[PDB]
Design a protein around this ligand. Structure first.
Ligand SMILES: CCOC(=O)CC[C@H](C[C@@H]1CCNC1=O)NC(=O)[C@@H](CC(=O)[C@@H](NC(=O)c1cc(C)on1)C(C)C)Cc1ccc(F)cc1
Length: 182
């Protein structure tokens, strides 16, 4: 509710970017330095649109956890002029569920949008259009196409990235701090 909403708003300007790839429109969380995270499904190429600018991509590396499981997110590094404000400290050391979370969407079509998704609960194994992953979490909210990459936040942590849904529920890849270690 209110507390996750205001924390979510504090991330928006400095860290939550509108992007476009050949696959469509996505929300992108910038984490530190020139490092950001996107859904694998966005399939970033050699350039990517960020806000109004076509930006060269330094690399895109699929995020695979310490158990060898693809998390369906890719870590992208960018030929941006400025570094992102470092939000490492807001990514929890442990994958975290949360009550009354906020999902932040920021795309050209859904700009600066805060979605009260309610409680985010453990889900675990998830088969997303035939691609299996784990460590996912679920919220009973009817998320939509165009919300992938959306940032799931608690009172003061960034806990997940929206990756899929079935029309009545939504699912995020869980985040923990070690995923972003250099
Ligand atoms: C570029 C445009 O594409 C997009 O908009 C990305 C947006 C949507 C957001 C969905 C869109 C709808 N409700 C939502 O919240 N995401 C996907 O579509 C994903 C597929 C699903 O959500 C599928 N769901 C399940 O499999 C699923 C399983 C359970 C359990 O619940 N849902 C549905 C398409 C059927 C794409 C994907 C494929 C393979 C993966 F490794 C990982 C992801």
């Amino acid at each position: 509710m209110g507390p996750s909403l205001d924390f979510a708003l504090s991330l928006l300007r400095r860290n939550i970017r509108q992007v476009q790839t050949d696959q469509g429109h996505f929300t992108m969380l910038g984490v530190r330095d020139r490092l950001a995270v996107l859904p694998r499904h966005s399939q970033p190429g050699k350039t990517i649109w960020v806000e109004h600018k076509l930006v060269n991509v330094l690399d895109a590396v699929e995020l695979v956890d310490e158990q060898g499981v693809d998390l369906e997110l890719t870590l992208i590094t960018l030929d941006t002029n400025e570094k992102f404000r470092d939000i490492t400290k807001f990514i929890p050391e442990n994958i975290s569920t949360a009550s009354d979370a906020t999902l932040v969407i920021n795309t050209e079509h859904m700009p600066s949008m805060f979605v009260p998704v309610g409680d985010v609960v453990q889900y675990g194994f998830l088969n997303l259009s035939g691609k299996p992953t784990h460590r996912t979490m679920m919220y009973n909210f009817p998320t939509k196409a165009g919300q992938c990459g959306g940032v799931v936040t608690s009172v003061g942590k960034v806990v997940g990235i929206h990756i899929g849904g079935n029309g009545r529920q939504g699912f995020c890849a869980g985040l923990k701090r070690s995923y972003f270690a250099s």
